[PDB]
Amino acid sequence: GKGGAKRHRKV
Amino acid sequence: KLSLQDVAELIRARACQRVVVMVGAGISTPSGIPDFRSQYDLPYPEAIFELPFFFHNPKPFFTLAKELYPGNYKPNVTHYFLRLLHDKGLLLRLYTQNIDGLERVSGIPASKLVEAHGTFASATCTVCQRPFPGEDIRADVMADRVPRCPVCTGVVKPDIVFFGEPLPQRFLLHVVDFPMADLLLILGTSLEVEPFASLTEAVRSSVPRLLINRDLVGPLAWHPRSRDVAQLGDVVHGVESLVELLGWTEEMRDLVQRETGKL
Ligand SMILES: [Zn+2]
């Protein structure tokens, strides 16, 4: 499971 | 290749006994809550949860806040399927990106919940980061006033994870929960938002992942695993189908009527 800030998934 | 019946058989055999659930706005529209693909005055759907637009015009976000401040909307059958999953001792944890709070209202214990995209029970100044408890801003919001920090004058914001903000620390329970799971349920979410979506990947490779959604898109569509299962369609109906195949339609009816009677 990834980390980071809430963001858009890269298509 | 597994069926939806196959999955329900696993549950009835208790071959799947530590079930984790990722849910989204899919499961709450049957209750009246907007899902932001759609009335609200935004230049595009996502600006309601973006910090630049929020500073320019917090009014749409606080409109949605006022709508969701509790007691307006009731839970529907998907929530109660999760509550019953708990009551039957099967729910390891329920990860949600919703901020409508009906997972709690349905009777699922905070203990079993991870509100991955935040909550209204707390707020933080947008500039100085001083915390405030929820009710302290609630009244402001319910009277179409914007609440400000008595220290720095910053707009103070409910602890809803916007785009660009970190997720709450409670989210890191996934580091423990996903490797224990013997079944992943994905319910009513197109998985458009990271890192939440990435969790579908963090169950063990032999673990079945059942999607009950409108669409089969994103991660689960791209890199699918042999024991994946998708019940495409209207989420409620898919759940109710699972419930019947489980045996629980009867005690489901009972639970829904009992709870909706309480409220
Ligand atoms: Zn401040």
Side-chain angles (χ1 to χ4, degrees):
Chain A
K2 297 171 167 205
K6 175 176 164 172
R7 72 199 175 258
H8 298 295
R9 173 190 51 63
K10 312 250 79 178
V11 289
Chain B
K1 177 91 189 68
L2 276 68
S3 75
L4 176 155
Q5 191 173 13
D6 284 329
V7 178
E9 277 322 290
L10 290 186
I11 304 184
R12 303 165 42 100
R14 265 200 85 99
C16 292
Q17 45 200 328
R18 308 166 310 279
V19 171
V20 48
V21 197
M22 320 167 47
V23 309
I27 69 144
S28 288
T29 57
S31 291
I33 287 93
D35 161 18
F36 281 86
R37 45 135 282 205
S38 317
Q39 51 152 266
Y40 271 81
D41 202 40
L42 307 137
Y44 51 85
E46 289 84 359
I48 193 84
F49 309 125
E50 284 176 349
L51 278 154
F53 183 86
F54 175 75
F55 304 135
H56 179 251
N57 188 1
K59 297 274 162 23
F61 177 76
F62 286 114
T63 285
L64 164 79
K66 186 186 166 176
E67 278 312 290
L68 292 166
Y69 261 111
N72 283 342
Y73 302 79
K74 299 160 196 49
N76 70 59
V77 191
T78 326
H79 301 113
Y80 289 119
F81 170 69
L82 305 175
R83 145 86 175 265
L84 196 82
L85 216 46
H86 166 82
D87 282 356
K88 294 192 160 291
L90 292 153
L91 173 57
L92 176 64
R93 207 135 279 130
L94 164 57
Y95 284 76
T96 190
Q97 29 201 324
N98 299 352
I99 58 185
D100 52 71
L102 316 159
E103 300 102 343
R104 285 262 51 239
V105 191
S106 69
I108 301 206
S111 124
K112 282 289 186 46
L113 204 45
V114 178
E115 317 176 48
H117 277 17
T119 180
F120 286 107
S122 5
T124 303
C125 178
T126 63
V127 316
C128 91
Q129 296 152 351
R130 192 160 253 97
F132 306 68
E135 184 82 66
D136 284 346
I137 83 173
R138 174 178 209 195
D140 281 317
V141 162
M142 301 289 317
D144 312 321
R145 313 180 303 241
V146 160
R148 302 190 118 108
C149 181
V151 166
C152 74
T153 83
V155 174
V156 48
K157 174 175 146 315
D159 276 343
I160 305 303
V161 184
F162 280 18
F163 291 99
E165 303 196 311
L167 276 58
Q169 292 167 177
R170 180 127 174 121
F171 183 72
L172 290 113
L173 272 163
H174 80 83
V175 185
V176 187
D177 277 346
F178 273 63
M180 273 156 61
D182 47 2
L183 172 69
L184 178 61
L185 249 61
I186 303 127
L187 260 50
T189 167
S190 35
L191 296 182
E192 317 213 19
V193 166
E194 290 296 10
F196 190 100
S198 78
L199 304 188
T200 74
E201 289 304 285
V203 286
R204 307 178 266 119
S205 52
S206 66
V207 181
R209 327 186 278 173
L210 160 61
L211 175 63
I212 303 189
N213 199 43
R214 191 59 268 220
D215 325 312
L216 158 83
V217 85
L220 309 152
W222 286 327
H223 324 120
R225 305 175 177 180
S226 85
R227 294 164 56 68
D228 289 349
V229 172
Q231 183 53 63
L232 305 175
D234 158 85
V235 161
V236 177
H237 179 246
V239 158
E240 275 176 354
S241 308
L242 182 39
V243 183
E244 164 60 36
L245 287 157
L246 282 173
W248 309 350
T249 294
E250 253 326 284
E251 86 160 293
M252 262 294 325
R253 292 191 216 283
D254 285 2
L255 178 87
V256 189
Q257 179 255 312
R258 174 183 322 118
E259 296 299 325
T260 53
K262 295 195 169 56
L263 305 90

